[PDB]
């Protein structure tokens, strides 16, 4: 949250980046710094700070009387992983709040019904 | 009763996707420039790391939500310079190069609507990862891919196809045959243009869904105003309470202030996890709607719009997404007199994929979602058993077009 | 770990352990420090319980999604695009995992293409034939009919098309011939 007037100074929109060369190319994002910029280590080596690239770029020769038909298929196998459950841990409130004492239990009994 | 005419209808649907990121310091808010407060706060243990961890988790989740919703493609397509789409006018949704950004007329007409001091108390805001221009580019690429390929680009490579034949496939996917489109293409094009114009007019004069998020995230005012309260002390200014007393009598005042401000921070952080969970659920629903309405043709009733579904186009409102479902509804009906089976010579003739209507005297077989009577030939039906078990059956004759040629 | 580490903070008392408080000092003057400790530990327990509740709700939502995917991808074939993988869906197999499930998604997907020239109808003799469940494609001289997801060309006949109307209102149309195989066999 400061400007680069105050304390390799590539002034960003997200702040003041110090210690990273500014290149003109466009690669994929490794470290999401923010506001478009993304830093990475692959440039003998030094950290760089480039601008995002949304991907490749192509066009299709769309016309009023042109169609494209596939001629050969392939078969693919992918994976997807979904958590289902987690551990079942219970906590006894008296043994944690108090210890083995008794006056502690008598004082805790004044707070009504929290442990339950 | 069978329809005899149809009218296209375009309707919108507004969904929120993400909300403003926020990182809140838990030491500047409580203490400030003092140091006695910083020493007294250390006794409470790790009550100034958990809040920061939770808030950063929320911010990362917001970035995740936007990335999941909008990044459905890898290649970035481009509309061809050719603008021959068989009659439709996609010049209010496709991007306009004249504007500084690439937001189309509807996109910036929508950005005009929603309107998107605190910092010096330790409250800071963070900038989004995907700047708005990238989101606009994603939406434009999705639009171009949908227009020039239909759905094939959503399951592998992108395959070119004329748009009229794509609409023929869309009609053939909901029961109506394709000659129905190929006969009156001009009427459908005109209806589509009129519907788009009406939507443009409607949005140019609501967005409560995207405004409730802002009016709930701007919480910050309550957090700020929970600083001018004594909380049982004598004055809610640390720089004054340490300039009118001594440590042994200032410690209790400082401690009361610490307790109050810690409770306020805990309440704020607790509320901004429930809000985050609700926003995440909405973003997941929006991602599903994109993936199924936009990159295909849905069959689930009343999922994408109201009526039958043809295609949809995405847009980009601030902190949300906007769809334009293109429905299909039938208009004009007529009474008739149906009959499940027509047995000719003791052989019932059930229809293949039609219905046996009659205009009073004759008997014609026609499809269900439209009206185009035909003659009851043999290739149009199929025999099954003898007509003595079918409940309601009327006795008539078939044509059998093989007869004339064999003479 | 954080819930455990909260058990070593004074919260304002002269020491963070209760046994020292109850051994070194007389209980009527120790009740205040005991109250301080109890308040701190109650705050910690409330925080932990609330955050665990939120995490449990999120895990429940994920488990419901996993159950739906198991019911639709595995025990049947789906058509919800990009639900059960990426591309057209053939089947899926389930595999267990520690506190989770892992799905394997066999998916059909097309490959190498070939440009073609199309037309939506065929004016044979004034009428206008239409493909039944195919698409008219021409390699450049002769017109064929093939399915829309795999190049397999067949000779256009009267058993692949059905007449509708006349060839003066369709925007695009091309003159061609229709085999009508009954006539050669009639002789
Ligand atoms: C398919 O699309 C175009 C057109 O090819 C022709 O399409 C019909 C009109 C018919 O006459 C076919 O027999 C022709 O093959 C071509 O796209 C070109 O792709 C190359 C790829 O390197 C590119 O350099 C050219 O600029 C493209 N041409 C145009 C006008 O865009 C090519 O034949 C096919 N394209 C692909 C990607 O397979
Ligand atoms: C597809 O579009 C092309 C034009 O891009 C049509 O070719 C002709 O192009 C000239 C260009 O000056 C136009 O004046 C003609 O009107 C076009 N022909 C027709 C029939 O409109 C081409 O014919 C189009 N093909 C189809 C099937 O409509
Ligand atoms: C479809 O693709 C498969 C795999 O690429 C082709 O099968 C190969 O064909 C080549 C040439 O005939 C053989 O040398 C290989 O042994 C085959 N198998 C593999 C695994 O490569 C198949 O021929 C293609 N079909 C068409 C019609 O192009
Ligand atoms: C089906 O409805 C459309 C309107 O949705 C009708 O189109 C109108 O037709 C009349 C003359 O028939 C024109 O004057 C209008 O300009 C057309 N458009 C509109 C919006 O009214 C169409 O005629 C109807 N078809 C049938 C068979 O009744
Ligand atoms: C139901 O539709 C048939 C369509 O064939 C009508 O048949 C017509 O009847 C008139 C009566 O004079 C003839 O002149 C026509 O040649 C017949 N065919 C056509 C295509 O019009 C029949 O009249 C209709 N029934 C009713 C009650 O309207
Ligand atoms: C386009 O398809 C036609 C129709 O098949 C081809 O014409 C004949 O094709 C068969 C094999 O399919 C050959 O055995 C014949 O010799 C072809 N006849 C002629 C006169 O060429 C045609 O070759 C295909 N290619 C082109 C460029 O037209
Ligand atoms: C930040 O510093 C740059 C470089 O001197 C200057 O151009 C810009 O106006 C400064 N911004 C602010 C808000 O002071
Ligand atoms: C990199 O971009 C900057 C800003 O546009 C420009 O001044 C500079 O000349 C560019 N350098 C190269 C090597 O392209
Ligand atoms: C599309 O509509 C705009 C606005 O009415 C108009 O300027 C443009 O000419 C139209 N394009 C076509 C192809 O009709
Ligand atoms: C069909 O008949 C009923 C009963 O008279 C009538 O109410 C209805 O309007 C008729 N339908 C049409 C399309 O005329
Ligand atoms: C059923 O068909 C027979 C022809 O064998 C005809 O005599 C009879 O009238 C038909 N049924 C009715 C209700 O008209
Ligand atoms: C087809 O033939 C008709 C005359 O039989 C002719 O007028 C027309 O130009 C031809 N070509 C078409 C319809 O594309």
């Amino acid at each position: 949250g400061v400007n680069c007037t105050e304390v390799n100074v590539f002034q960003t929109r997200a702040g003041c980046l110090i210690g990273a060369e500014h290149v003109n190319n466009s690669y994929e994002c490794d470290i999401p710094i923010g506001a478009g910029i993304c830093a990475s280590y692959q440039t003998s080596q030094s950290i760089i700070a480039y601008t995002m690239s949304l991907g490749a770029e192509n066009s299709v020769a769309y016309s009023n009387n042109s169609i494209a038909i596939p001629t050969n298929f392939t078969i693919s196998v992918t994976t997807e992983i979904l958590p289902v459950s987690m551990t079942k841990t219970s906590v006894d409130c008296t043994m944690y709040i108090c210890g083995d004492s008794t006056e502690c239990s008598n004082l805790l009994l004044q707070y009504g019904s929290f442990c339950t | 009763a069978i329809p005899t005419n149809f009218t296209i209808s375009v309707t919108t649907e507004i969904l929120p996707v993400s909300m403003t990121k926020t990182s809140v310091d838990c030491t500047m808010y409580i203490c400030g420039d003092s140091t006695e407060c910083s020493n007294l706060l250390l006794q409470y243990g790790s009550f100034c790391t958990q809040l920061n961890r939770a808030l950063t988790g929320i911010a990362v989740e917001q970035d995740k939500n936007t990335q999941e919703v909008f990044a459905q493609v890898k290649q970035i397509y481009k509309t061809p310079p050719i603008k021959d789409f068989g009659g439709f006018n996609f010049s209010q949704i496709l991007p306009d190069p004249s504007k500084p950004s690439k937001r189309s007329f509807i996109e910036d007409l929508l950005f005009n609507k929603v309107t998107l001091a605190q910092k010096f108390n330790g409250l800071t805001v963070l900038p989004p990862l995907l700047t708005d221009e990238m989101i606009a580019q994603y939406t434009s690429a999705l639009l171009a891919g949908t227009i020039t390929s239909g759905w094939t680009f959503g399951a592998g490579a992108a395959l070119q196809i004329p748009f009229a034949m794509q609409m023929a496939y869309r009609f053939n996917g909901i029961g109506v045959t394709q000659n129905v489109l190929y006969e009156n293409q001009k009427l459908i094009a005109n209806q589509f243009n009129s519907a788009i114009g009406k939507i443009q007019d409607s949005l140019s004069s609501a967005l409560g869904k995207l405004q409730d998020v802002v009016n709930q995230n701007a919480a910050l005012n309550t957090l700020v105003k929970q600083l001018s309260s004594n909380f049982g002390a004598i004055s809610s200014v640390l720089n004054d309470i340490l300039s009118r007393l001594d440590p042994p009598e200032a410690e209790v005042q400082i401690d009361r202030l610490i307790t109050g401000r810690l409770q306020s921070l805990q309440t704020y952080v607790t509320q901004q996890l429930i809000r985050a969970a609700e926003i995440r659920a909405s973003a997941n629903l929006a991602a599903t709607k994109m993936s199924e309405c936009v990159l295909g043709q849905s069959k689930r009733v009343d999922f994408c719009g109201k009526g039958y579904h043809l295609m949809s186009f995405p847009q980009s409102a601030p902190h949300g997404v906007v769809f334009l479902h293109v429905t299909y509804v039938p208009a004009q009906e007529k009474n008739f007199t149906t009959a499940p089976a027509i047995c000719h010579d003791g052989k019932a003739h059930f229809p293949r994929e039609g219905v046996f209507v009659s205009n009073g005297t004759h008997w014609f077989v026609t499809q269900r979602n439209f009206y185009e009577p035909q003659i009851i030939t043999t290739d149009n039906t199929f025999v099954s058993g003898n007509c003595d078990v079918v409940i309601g059956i009327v006795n008539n004759t078939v044509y059998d077009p093989l007869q004339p040629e064999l003479d």
Side-chain angles (χ1 to χ4, degrees), chain B residues 118-137:
Chain B
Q118 296 167 350
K119 295 184 184 183
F120 318 134
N121 293 107
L123 295 174
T124 61
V125 187
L126 284 157
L129 169 52
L130 291 176
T131 185
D132 178 271
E133 165 60 37
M134 308 209 180
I135 289 177
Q137 268 197 87

Side-chain angles (χ1 to χ4, degrees), chain A residues 54-72:
Chain A
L54 304 174
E57 161 155 351
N58 64 8
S59 175
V60 295
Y62 155 80
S63 175
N64 48 10
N65 61 349
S66 74
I67 202 173
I69 300 296
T71 59
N72 205 13

Side-chain angles (χ1 to χ4, degrees), chain B residues 71 98 140 145 192 212 270 355 379 382 389 394:
Chain B
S98 71
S140 85
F192 185 99
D212 60 52
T270 289
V355 71
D379 65 352
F382 64 89
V389 186
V394 298

Side-chain angles (χ1 to χ4, degrees), chain B residues 238-254:
Chain B
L238 283 175
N239 282 327
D240 176 89
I241 193 65
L242 62 83
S243 73
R244 281 215 286 96
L245 279 185
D246 63 358
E249 320 172 61
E251 280 201 28
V252 295
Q253 302 292 320
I254 287 183

Side-chain angles (χ1 to χ4, degrees), chain A residues 28-63:
Chain A
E28 285 276 10
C29 183
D30 284 290
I31 307 279
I33 279 179
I37 319 294
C38 275
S40 191
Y41 187 45
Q42 206 48 263
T43 73
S44 169
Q45 304 292 337
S46 48
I47 293 190
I48 57 175
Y50 47 80
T51 307
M52 271 305 258
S53 88
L54 304 174
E57 161 155 351
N58 64 8
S59 175
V60 295
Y62 155 80
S63 175

Side-chain angles (χ1 to χ4, degrees), chain A residues 4-15:
Chain A
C4 295
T5 53
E6 293 86 335
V7 302
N8 320 118
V9 182
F10 168 76
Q11 158 86 48
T12 63
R13 169 66 193 83

